[PDB]
Amino acid sequence: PKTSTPR
Amino acid sequence: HLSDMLQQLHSVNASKPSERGLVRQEEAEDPACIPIFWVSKWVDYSDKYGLGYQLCDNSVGVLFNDSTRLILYNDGDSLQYIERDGTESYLTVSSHPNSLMKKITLLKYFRNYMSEHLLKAGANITPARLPYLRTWFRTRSAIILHLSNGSVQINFFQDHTKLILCPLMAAVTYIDEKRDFRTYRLSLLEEYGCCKELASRLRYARTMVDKLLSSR
């Protein structure tokens, strides 16, 4: 994962 | 700070809190030790620029690959710039040096990306100097964030559970899979005991924290 949790 | 917390973590899992006859996790809750700050969103562009993150008060920061730091307050205007050696300078996006234009547009790209794409962690929690990201590292299962107020946070990529360790309050905040948050005194999980899942993650936090201690 390149970012934290998306919405 | 971290040596304070490693000792605390060492007592607690020396206590083997999962193997108690009657585990009373709920009696170790201490609503008054909820952290004021935690990382609610993050973007890892470290191959190009560095680590962009949001704080739970809606301020955002960047730890650049050169180990500089740039913080934007939640007023959208006040900046703090920290050089590698820790030198601190106050600026604004209004009245700012032109040597920082590249870093300020990079910060503005990070803030815009996080606003459009991401879910703010712990948004149901109602939480002091503003902290900056001191250091961070990833593994295959978690990212580890260490804030300049001494707090260490661990986000697991698996179940989205999150740990927040505060050395000052001697407290750990655990956000479980269904996003419910509970804050505990570490010395009250010494006594009452804890779940196996949270003992498993406290064990793993001891490793991550002597990694952090070895980075100095």
* Phi, psi angle pair for B213, to nearest 5°: -65, -30
Asked if A3 lies within 8 A of B117 by C-beta distance, the reply is: yes
B216 touches chain A (CB under 8 A): no
Whole-number Å distance between alpha carbons of B145 and B6: 15
- Which element (helix H / strand E) includes B40? strand B39-45
Q: Which residues make Cβ contacts (< 8 Å) with residue A5, sequence separation at least 6?
A: B118, B119, B121, B160
- Which element (helix H / strand E) includes B138? strand B133-138
| Alpha-carbon gap: B31 to the closest alpha carbon of chain A (Å) | 26
Triad B151, A7, B172: Cα angle to 5°: 20
SS3 content of chain B, % helix, strand, coil (to 5): 30, 30, 40
Cβ neighbours of A7 in B, within 8 Å: 117-119
CA B3 to chain centre: 17
- Report the chain B residue with the minimal C-alpha distance to residue A1: B157
CA B74 to chain centre: 18
Triad B168, B156, B29: Cα angle to 5°: 40
B125 lies in a domain? no
Let me know whether B49 and B93 are in one domain: yes
Closest alpha carbon to B93 in B82, B109, B104: B104
- Report the chain B residue with the minimal C-alpha distance to residue A4: B42
Cβ neighbours of A1 in B, within 8 Å: 157
Q: Which amino acid is at B5?
A: M
Which of B44, B138, B156, B179 should one mutate to test binding to chain A, selecting the residue with the greatest count of A CBs within 10 A?
B44
Residues B128, B115 contacting (CB under 8 angstroms): no
Closest alpha carbon to B138 in B119, B120, B156: B156
Let me know whether B57 and B25 are in one domain: no
Let me know whether B34 and B46 are in one domain: no
B209 lies in a domain? yes
Residues B153, B37 contacting (CB under 8 angstroms): no
Let me know whether B20 and B60 are in one domain: no
R_g of chain A, CA atoms, integer Å: 5
Method: X-ray
State the CATH number of the domain containing residue B202: 3.30.1120.30
Last residue of a domain, one of B120, B150, B165: B120
Tell how many helices (H) and how many strands (E) occur in chain A. Answer: 0, 0
B151: which 2 tokens?
């707090």
| B-proximal residues of A, 1-7, CB under 8 Å | 1-7
Last residue of a domain, one of B99, B120, B141: B120
| A-proximal residues of B, 130-169, CB under 8 Å | 155, 157, 160
- Report the chain B residue with the minimal C-alpha distance to residue A6: B118
Q: Which residues make Cβ contacts (< 8 Å) with residue B118, sequence separation at least 6?
A: A3, A4, A5, A6, A7, B41, B43, B54
- Domain boundaries, position B93: 41-120
- Which element (helix H / strand E) includes B171? strand B171-175
Sheet holding B181-185, edge to edge: B133-138, B142-147, B152-156, B162-166, B171-175, B181-185
Last residue of a domain, one of B120, B150, B166: B120
Q: Which amino acid is at B170?
A: A
Let me know whether B103 and B52 are in one domain: yes
B122: which 2 tokens?
């712990």
